[PDB]
């Protein structure tokens, strides 16, 4: 659901001792992993994670692998600098993360560009929606902000986001078309769990759906109910699960309806408890 998107999520973790950091880069198209680079692999290289990426030839993989080797070194220098900014011990365990990417508009142009960093899992510095200014989250990030305002880092990332990001995303959507257009509709059912004090839990399940975007609602006699909702979770086969439950009075279960909204469905599913 929503605009097409591409993201690269990159992480470097320093390791205690003389051991160099672990660097992992994961690429996503429309929230599904499509490429991965891991420095801990026997032969570190970008690998296709979505099989439609095997439409790319050896030159693509070589160029992207060389780029990952450069990014890994940038993260290594950045981790060292951050030790100094926060006055931390040289042989410790620390994490630097980056998120970058683009959302496409109806003109196949950039709709929103994303470029931010975190240190120890907390916001560090981010490029604002204008792709011109920086948000430093803390006092150490002020050092980086001055350095990057002086180096013109924002212009550099704005050019990637408005150009390469958008163009490569369009290429991947064309190559992955046959897979990216596939939807798996949720299969839904309601389960009944008696409680004490004349109450019943009704649980509406949505299973085996793709993409992960979904809405589950409960209504009493057609009126919305504001319900326990678990976080969408992977089934382990590429599809997802979710459930929503309500506590209702015993004997009044038929007055409640669950509704499931998902893009694979020609229309929302409406269902209720079906006693055997």
């Amino acid at each position: 659901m929503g605009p097409h998107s591409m993201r690269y999520f990159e992480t470097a973790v320093s390791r205690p001792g003389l051991e160099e950091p672990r660097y992992i880069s994961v690429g996503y198209v429309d929230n599904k992993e499509f490429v991965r680079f891991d420095s801990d692999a026997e032969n570190p290289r970008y690998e296709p994670r979505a099989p439609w990426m095997e439409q790319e030839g050896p030159e693509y993989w070589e160029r992207e692998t060389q780029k990952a080797k450069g990014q890994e070194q940038w993260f290594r220098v950045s981790l060292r600098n951050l030790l100094g900014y926060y006055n931390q011990s040289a042989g410790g365990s620390h994490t630097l993360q980056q998120m970058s990417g683009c959302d496409l508009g109806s003109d196949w142009r950039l709709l929103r560009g994303y470029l931010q960093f975190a240190y120890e899992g907390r916001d560090y510095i981010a490029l604002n929606e204008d792709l011109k200014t920086w948000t430093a989250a803390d006092m150490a990030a002020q050092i980086t902000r001055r350095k990057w305002e002086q180096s013109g880092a924002a212009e550099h990332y704005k050019a990637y986001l408005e150009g390469e990001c958008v163009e490569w995303l369009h290429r991947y959507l064309k190559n992955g078309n046959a897979t990216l257009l596939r939807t798996d509709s949720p299969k839904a059912h309601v389960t009944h769990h008696p409680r004490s004090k004349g109450e019943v839990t009704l649980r509406c399940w949505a299973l085996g759906f793709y993409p992960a975007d979904i809405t589950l609602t409960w209504q009493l006699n057609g009126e919305e109910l504001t319900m326990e909702l678990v976080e969408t979770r992977p089934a382990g086969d590429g599809t997802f699960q979710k459930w929503a439950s309500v506590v209702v009075p015993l004997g009044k279960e038929q007055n409640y309806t669950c509704r499931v909204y998902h893009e694979g469905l020609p229309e929302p599913l409406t269902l209720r408890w079906e006693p055997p």
Partner: peptide, 10 residues
């Protein structure tokens, strides 16, 4: 195709 963060580190 991922970003190239360039020559200037944090």
């Amino acid at each position: 195709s991922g970003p190239d963060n360039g020559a200037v580190a944090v």
